[PDB]
Design an enzyme around this catalytic site. Structure first.
Site, PDB file in Angstrom:
ATOM      1  N   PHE A  57      50.851  36.142  32.599  1.00  0.00           N
ATOM      2  CA  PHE A  57      50.326  37.500  32.668  1.00  0.00           C
ATOM      3  C   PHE A  57      50.459  38.267  31.359  1.00  0.00           C
ATOM      4  O   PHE A  57      49.826  39.314  31.216  1.00  0.00           O
ATOM      5  CB  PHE A  57      50.995  38.285  33.800  1.00  0.00           C
ATOM      6  CG  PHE A  57      50.264  38.182  35.104  1.00  0.00           C
ATOM      7  CD1 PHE A  57      49.029  37.545  35.157  1.00  0.00           C
ATOM      8  CD2 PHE A  57      50.802  38.703  36.270  1.00  0.00           C
ATOM      9  CE1 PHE A  57      48.337  37.431  36.345  1.00  0.00           C
ATOM     10  CE2 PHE A  57      50.122  38.594  37.468  1.00  0.00           C
ATOM     11  CZ  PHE A  57      48.884  37.952  37.508  1.00  0.00           C
TER      12      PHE A  57
ATOM     13  N   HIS B 221      37.913  38.152  37.055  1.00  0.00           N
ATOM     14  CA  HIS B 221      38.138  39.415  37.745  1.00  0.00           C
ATOM     15  C   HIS B 221      36.837  40.041  38.217  1.00  0.00           C
ATOM     16  O   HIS B 221      36.838  40.813  39.187  1.00  0.00           O
ATOM     17  CB  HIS B 221      38.922  40.376  36.854  1.00  0.00           C
ATOM     18  CG  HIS B 221      40.397  40.286  37.064  1.00  0.00           C
ATOM     19  ND1 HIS B 221      41.023  40.871  38.146  1.00  0.00           N
ATOM     20  CD2 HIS B 221      41.366  39.655  36.363  1.00  0.00           C
ATOM     21  CE1 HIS B 221      42.320  40.608  38.096  1.00  0.00           C
ATOM     22  NE2 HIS B 221      42.555  39.886  37.015  1.00  0.00           N
TER      23      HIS B 221
ATOM     24  N   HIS C 148      43.396  34.454  43.920  1.00  0.00           N
ATOM     25  CA  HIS C 148      43.603  35.024  42.586  1.00  0.00           C
ATOM     26  C   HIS C 148      44.656  34.256  41.792  1.00  0.00           C
ATOM     27  O   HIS C 148      44.412  33.817  40.658  1.00  0.00           O
ATOM     28  CB  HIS C 148      44.003  36.502  42.718  1.00  0.00           C
ATOM     29  CG  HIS C 148      44.396  37.143  41.423  1.00  0.00           C
ATOM     30  ND1 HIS C 148      43.536  37.237  40.347  1.00  0.00           N
ATOM     31  CD2 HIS C 148      45.552  37.731  41.034  1.00  0.00           C
ATOM     32  CE1 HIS C 148      44.151  37.842  39.346  1.00  0.00           C
ATOM     33  NE2 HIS C 148      45.378  38.156  39.739  1.00  0.00           N
TER      34      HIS C 148
END
Length: 471
Positions: free
Chosen positions: A245, A258, A216
């Site tokens: 982020f 995702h 990830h």
């Protein structure tokens, strides 16, 4: 990070699934038919239009991006508890619910009740390039705020730490699939290792599971711009978009990444056994807040997202060739003389991991019975990994080798795992399940084994290292 939210969560109703379940199929993002690409672009385009026409609408492009930013920044609380959805066991169910509503929004904007959010198939060799549909400038899927490591037909680096690839193409592909094998099989034999743990009190030690660490984090790093570089707009980069982020949701590819992370949850459970969902009531009854596609506010529970078919979607069946990537060869013949390297007690706390270092470590039990191995997992644990949360960090872990190990070749029986970090003093833990390696190398009767740490990026300290038996 100006996310919309109700002020009083106790008045927000719980979500009810529609009585008519309309099954969506999420397809691989590569080789998608142009008609699907066209309607994906149209949905995203209409979502972006709302940024201008209805800036306060929660289903608009910027506002859905803000929801993720605010969740990662601690801006949502339910029942008086802040929702911690990163470096924690909430990582998978939060993103499942997040994408569930995001996919319903996309479908609603184009009147397509079965629209399926594609997945970036970066665990399969055919999907390890940047997906072409996202790299068409002038379409709604495009984002100019991406690195240029992503073109030239380059394969993704699933262990990227922001630098260029240093191996051959064959070795990079080999390393990618070896990392998948280690992260989806070896190092996630049981739920808490896959999902991570509670990150509730402080206890400010990050508790990510396997996938959240790798692959990830390297995908974010690989796609985003290089921090410090000049953006196409002229300003200095902080990793925008995917590499930060705060801004990651501003790249349409974020959701497609995702989608594959969510697919990993399905693939991990597909072999059953101990790879099941967390049975802890605290996890199952954890809650999140979302707006549905009609702009209505709802609370949802972890326990209601465990089965994607019950939520009305599944992934197009796709081969997982990393299941065949248990290394067949050893990097080092024989067994390391553990008397000729320093014991862990002499190395740690390690102020700085500046270069490769090897040490011996004691196992709590040797010659373990099969029932013992079933009951308790043998876990090599790196405690108090500390670094500057503005740094890129990576180190690799090998068993039964020496300081001269070629850490560019991960397809070896001795390769145990890796730790990486995406820039937000941080404190973190790494857990590696080593039974499979002890069996393959022939170390199951040893009371003491050799461990080698190889730093690849960043200034890293490590407080201690221990082998424990976890339930």
């Amino acid at each position: 990070c100006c996310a919309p939210k109700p002020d009083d969560m106790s008045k927000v109703p719980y979500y009810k699934f529609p009585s008519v379940t309309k099954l969506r199929i999420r397809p691989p993002a590569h080789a998608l038919d142009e008609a699907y690409i066209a309607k994906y672009n149209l949905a995203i385009s209409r979502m972006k239009d709302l940024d201008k026409t209805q800036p306060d609408n929660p289903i608009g492009f910027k506002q859905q991006a803000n929801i993720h930013c605010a969740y990662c920044n601690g801006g949502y609380s339910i029942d008086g508890k802040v929702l911690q959805v990163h470096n924690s066991w909430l990582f998978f169910p939060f993103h499942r619910w997040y994408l569930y509503f995001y996919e319903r929004i996309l479908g609603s904007l184009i009147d397509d009740p079965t629209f399926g959010l594609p997945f970036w198939n970066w665990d399969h060799p055919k999907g390890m390039r940047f997906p072409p549909m996202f790299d068409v400038p002038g379409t709604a899927l495009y984002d100019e705020r991406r690195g240029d490591q992503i073109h030239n037909g380059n394969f993704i680096d699933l262990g990227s730490f922001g630098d260029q690839v240093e191996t051959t193409q064959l070795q990079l592909m080999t390393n990618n699939l070896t990392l998948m094998y280690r992260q989806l099989v070896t190092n996630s034999p049981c739920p808490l290792m896959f999902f991570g743990g509670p990150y509730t009190l402080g206890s400010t030690v990050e508790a990510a599971g396997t996938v959240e660490n790798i692959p990830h984090s390297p995908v974010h790093i690989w796609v985003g711009t290089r921090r410090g570089s000049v953006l196409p707009d002229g300003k200095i980069s902080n990793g925008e978009d995917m590499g930060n982020f705060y801004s990651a949701g501003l790249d349409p590819l974020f959701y497609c990444h995702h989608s594959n992370v969510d697919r990993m949850w399905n693939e991990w459970k597909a072999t059953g056994g101990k790879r099941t969902d967390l049975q802890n009531k605290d996890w199952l009854n954890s809650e999140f807040f979302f707006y549905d596609e009609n702009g209505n506010p709802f609370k949802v529970r972890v326990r209601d997202c465990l089965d994607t078919k019950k939520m009305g979607y599944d992934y197009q069946p796709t081969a997982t060739p990393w299941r065949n990537f248990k290394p067949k060869t050893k990097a080092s013949a024989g067994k390391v003389n553990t008397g000729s390297i320093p014991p862990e007690s002499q190395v740690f706390p390690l102020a700085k991991l500046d270069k490769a270092i090897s040490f011996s470590i004691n196992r709590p039990a040797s010659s373990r019975t099969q029932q013992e191995k079933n009951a308790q997992e043998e876990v090599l644990t790196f405690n108090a990994i500390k670094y500057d949360n503005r740094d890129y960090i990576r180190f690799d872990v090998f068993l039964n080798v020496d300081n001269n190990v070629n850490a560019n070749e991960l397809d070896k029986a001795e390769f145990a795992g890796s730790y990486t970090s995406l820039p937000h003093t941080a404190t973190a833990t790494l857990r590696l399940a080593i039974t499979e390696l002890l069996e393959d190398i022939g170390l199951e009767d040893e009371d003491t084994i050799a461990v080698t740490l190889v730093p690849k990026k960043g200034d890293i300290s490590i407080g201690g290292v221990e082998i424990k038996l976890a339930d």
